[PDB]
């Protein structure tokens, strides 16, 4: 904007800095990435969804997350991060299943299928009873 090294948002939060090296840096609080947990009581299993975050950025930003999340992100496991329309998710497998009732909704007509005592991503699609011409 001008000859200023600090960038502030409308609410006076420091969001950007210009450094001596010549780079520009985005400034965020040490806990910024939203985290939500999908838990199933019957099987005592859980999964993690990072809302509105690209999977690639989640790999770089690990210091906010818990120890097991850090270990799983570093381990590059097979059930690793999957990009959905509601953010990056861990512990899910992409399936083409279609359901009409959901107990663990994720938004945008997405559903989570708990494992029988990983989680499966299903979709909510409704069907009319009959069509009469």
């Amino acid at each position: 904007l001008r000859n200023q090294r600090f960038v502030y948002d409308t609410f006076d939060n420091l969001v950007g800095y210009h450094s001596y090296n010549g780079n520009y840096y985005c400034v965020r609080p040490c806990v910024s990435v939203p985290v939500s947990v999908i838990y199933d009581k019957v099987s005592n299993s859980h999964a993690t969804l990072f809302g509105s975050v690209a999977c690639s950025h989640v790999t770089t930003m690990m210091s906010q997350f818990s120890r097991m999340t850090k270990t799983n992100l570093l381990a590059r496991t097979t059930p690793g991060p999957l990009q959905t329309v509601v953010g990056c998710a861990m512990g899910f497998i992409n399936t083409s299943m279609v359901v009409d009732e959901c107990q663990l909704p994720l938004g945008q007509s997405l559903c989570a299928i708990p494992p029988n005592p990983v989680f499966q991503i299903a979709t909510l699609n409704f069907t009319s009873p009959l069509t009469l011409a």
């Binding site: 948002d9 609410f11 939060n13 969001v15 806990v31 959905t84 953010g87 938004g107 409704f126 009319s128």
Partner: protein, 453 residues
């Protein structure tokens, strides 16, 4: 009232179709707040002091989670009608002579299916709503930089709150609105809800018009005029999305309320509340432990007050949205899937048919009513009978016994209650009733029901 026998009644001679617009909200924006981050911002000294106010954060989280769960249940209940609603396929563009092009979703030969109708596209383009970064908002807020119109969305990752996505994507809402459009046509003389008749839209409209006091002869003569008036009424509401429209203004009011709640939540973090600074780091850097506690406590108290106010208003709006959603279900069942005999519930005038389209955070209704424009003063009678030792008196059915004029030898006719068109009295439009003192005595001219053949 007239001084002769009988009574004067104003019967319309010309009519037009009026449209009443109504907006009903169904859901609000779901918000979750990270209480620990919002209050203490990761500083252990603040968190130690926060314990003296009890388990504040856990209660805040539980209350917000319960509110979101209730809203999800409420919206799920409304959309469940799709599973058990019988529907019939409508024609493209013209269904007889009525034009329903704008209310239908345009079919595409190749590509991605559309989820918005022409009228819905017109409605949504008139309302400014920020995109709440459902998929990649966190990255976009960094790649785009600080923007005044987008600071409310990007404040999620600084203040410590999250905007949850809605339960259903817009494709589900489009399916719901298309389901409503395909269930309007049906039978009208049945006394149940267990049978579905595949009656065309035009015949259903004509049956609805015949039940409000318009005879079959008038409908047959004025078929094209009625169709043209209906098309003119439907086409006139495409350009009715202006600031003068109160119903359209309430949609923007709902959007502004949703924005205002997050604006209030975000702005409270910049207040000092009487402390030397609004930042915990500044307090720790400028003061020593004996004096830091008081300033940190002042900030804690201010932020706790802000969170309590936000939670209370969020619960209020959730309850109001649930009641409004129930009202929407009642409006759909009464005005959309059937014809209403009530006054004032489905628009003004005599109700004929209603349509429902998707709207931001709710539904938009178009109530079509029968609106007369001109009237005629007609002389009417309570009943008619001959002069015999036993009398047989008759009364009109759904109409009036009137004389054929606009201003002992009088000739009586029958007319519909909603349109003036005299026609001979038969047993179709009359029924036998008991003897009444105010009934006319017909000496010479007798209708066939009154003839002792």
């Amino acid at each position: 009232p007239i001084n002769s026998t009988g009574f004067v009644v104003a019967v319309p001679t010309n009519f037009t179709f009026g449209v009443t617009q109504e907006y009903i909200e169904t859901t609000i924006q779901k918000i979750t707040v990270d209480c620990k981050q919002y209050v203490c911002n990761g500083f252990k000294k603040c968190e130690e002091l926060l314990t003296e106010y009890g388990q504040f954060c856990s209660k805040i989280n539980q209350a917000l989670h319960g509110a979101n769960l209730r809203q999800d249940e409420s919206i799920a209940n409304l959309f469940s009608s799709i599973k058990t609603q019988n529907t019939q396929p409508l024609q493209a563009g013209l269904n007889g002579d009525f034009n329903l092009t704008m209310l239908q979703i345009p079919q595409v030969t190749t590509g991605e299916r559309k989820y918005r109708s022409a009228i819905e596209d017109l409605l949504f383009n008139k309302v400014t709503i920020a995109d709440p970064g459902y998929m990649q908002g966190y990255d976009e807020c960094m790649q785009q930089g600080p923007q005044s119109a987008r600071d409310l969305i990007c404040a999620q990752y600084v203040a410590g709150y999250k905007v949850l996505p809605p339960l259903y994507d817009p494709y589900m809402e489009a399916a719901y609105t298309s389901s409503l459009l395909g269930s309007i046509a049906g039978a009208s003389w049945t006394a149940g809800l267990s049978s579905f008749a595949a009656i065309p839209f035009a015949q259903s409209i004509f049956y609805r018009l015949n039940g409000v006091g318009i005879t079959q002869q008038v409908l047959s003569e004025n078929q094209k005029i009625i169709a043209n008036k209906f098309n003119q009424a439907l086409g006139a509401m495409q350009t009715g999305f202006t600031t003068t429209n109160l119903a359209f203004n309430k949609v923007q009011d709902a959007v502004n309320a949703n924005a205002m709640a997050l604006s209030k939540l975000a702005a409270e973090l910049s207040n000092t509340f009487g402390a030397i600074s609004s930042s915990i780091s500044d307090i720790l850097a400028r003061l020593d432990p004996p004096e830091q506690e008081a300033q940190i406590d002042r900030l804690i108290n201010g932020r706790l007050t802000s969170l309590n106010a936000f939670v209370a208003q969020q619960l209020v709006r959730t309850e109001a949205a649930a009641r409004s959603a129930q009202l929407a279900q009642d409006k759909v069942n009464e005005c959309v899937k059937s014809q209403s005999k009530r006054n004032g519930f489905c628009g003004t005038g005599t109700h004929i048919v209603s349509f429902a389209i998707n709207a931001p955070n709710g539904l938009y209704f178009f109530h079509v009513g029968y609106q007369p424009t001109s009237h005629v003063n007609a002389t009417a009678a309570y009943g008619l009978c001959n002069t015999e030792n036993p009398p047989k008196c008759i009364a009109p059915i759904g109409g009036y016994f009137v004389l054929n004029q606009t201003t002992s030898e009088q000739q009586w006719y029958y007319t519909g209650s909603s349109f003036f068109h005299p026609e001979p009295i038969t047993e179709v439009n009359s029924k036998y009733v008991s003897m009444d003192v105010k009934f006319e005595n017909l000496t010479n001219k007798l209708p066939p029901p009154l003839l002792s053949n």
